[PDB]
Design a protein around this ligand. Structure first.
Ligand SMILES: Cc1ccc2nc(CCc3nc4c(Cl)cc(Cl)c(C)n4n3)[nH]c2c1C
Ligand SMILES: [Mg+2]
Ligand SMILES: [Zn+2]
Length: 312
């Protein structure tokens, strides 16, 4: 059969956590398929269906600075790296569902936060009172799965199918950062009191949620220039949201106020300390082979420290 392969530098570097998928959009679908094939198998999906699914997914991301198709493929690659470094800890449905969840997790994002949707009073905020965007993303995922010739899970039983979609739903909801804090605390407590049990489905769920946050934040685990340049895209969205807040006559939070450009290095520090480092710490405790993510995050915190000290 037909193996996907990649040029040598990509073939080797794609295995690493800090891999950057590059500026060539047209290679991203091939990169994704390569990853599905090695982490799941060449038999997981019918090639024609999968290609058709990928292209509809891509069509349904919008051209926003950060929450775009490149972000989806990046988040899927980090999940790939995690799965490949812990290959025996995951069921076959999980391998199947999680890369798909990652590719789908921000479908049809508009570049605005849940909080902005609520203040604007967007129709999505009446349809979904919490995790507004994330329920929308899962909803779009189901839509695409139901298009003719797009059912990549056709080979599964009714019940396996329901299990995979339920893995996907939960993985996608977990990318709501508001939910991450409580989830990481629970996981911390269970690991430390020795009660963490991966045969317990609700424990697995929590562990998979933290994986999702880890993959979704993975721009803080890249080479410094990738990290630094991605941060620019991240703020370009947040500041456009800030302007939109001001348009509604509401003072935006400092994160989203472009008048506070100067405080970026400091906001990054808070963010690495409150969110990123704890995320990768607990992930490393639970899944030791993911330590390179923690190590890279700490390297990048150290770089933001240098930016503050005027050494950059
Ligand atoms: C003035 C002020 C106050 C509070 C702030 N908090 C930040 C962090 C923003 C942020 N958010 C994210 C997310 Cl959701 C993902 C990733 Cl991967 C990254 C790297 N980031 N970074 N900046 C702040 C500023 C400038
Ligand atoms: Mg999201
Ligand atoms: Zn995301």
């Amino acid at each position: 059969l037909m193996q996907f392969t990649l040029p040598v530098r990509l073939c080797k570097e794609i295995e690493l956590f800090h891999f950057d998928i590059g500026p060539f959009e047209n290679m991203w679908p091939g990169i994704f398929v390569y990853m599905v094939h090695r982490s799941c198998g060449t038999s997981c999906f019918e090639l024609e269906k999968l290609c058709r699914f990928i292209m509809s997914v891509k069509k349904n991301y919008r051209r926003v600075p950060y929450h775009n198709w490149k972000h989806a493929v990046t988040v899927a690659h980090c999940m790939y790296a995690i799965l490949q470094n812990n290959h025996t800890l995951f069921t076959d449905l999980e391998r199947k569902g999680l890369l798909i969840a990652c590719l789908c997790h921000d479908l049809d994002h508009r570049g605005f936060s849940n909080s902005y949707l609520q203040k604007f009073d967007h129709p999505l905020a009446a349809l979904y009172s919490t995790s507004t965007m994330e329920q929308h993303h899962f909803s779009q995922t189901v839509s695409i799965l139901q298009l003719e010739g797009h059912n990549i899970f056709s080979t599964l039983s009714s019940s396996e199918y329901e299990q995979v979609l339920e893995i996907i739903r939960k993985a996608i909801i977990a990318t709501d950062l508001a939910l991450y804090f409580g989830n990481r605390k629970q996981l911390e407590e269970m690991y430390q009191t020795g009660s963490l049990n991966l045969n317990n489905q609700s424990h697995r769920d929590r562990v998979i949620g933290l994986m999702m946050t880890a993959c979704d934040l993975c721009s803080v685990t890249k080479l410094w220039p990738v990290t630094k340049l991605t941060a620019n895209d991240i703020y370009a969205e947040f500041w456009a949201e800030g302007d939109e807040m001001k348009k509604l006559g509401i003072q935006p939070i400092p994160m989203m106020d472009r008048d506070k450009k100067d405080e970026v290095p400091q906001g990054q520090l808070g963010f690495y300390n409150a969110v990123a480092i704890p995320c990768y710490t607990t992930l490393t405790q639970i899944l030791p082979p993911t330590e390179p993510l923690l190590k890279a995050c700490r390297d990048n915190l150290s770089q933001w420290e240098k930016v503050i000290r005027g050494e950059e």
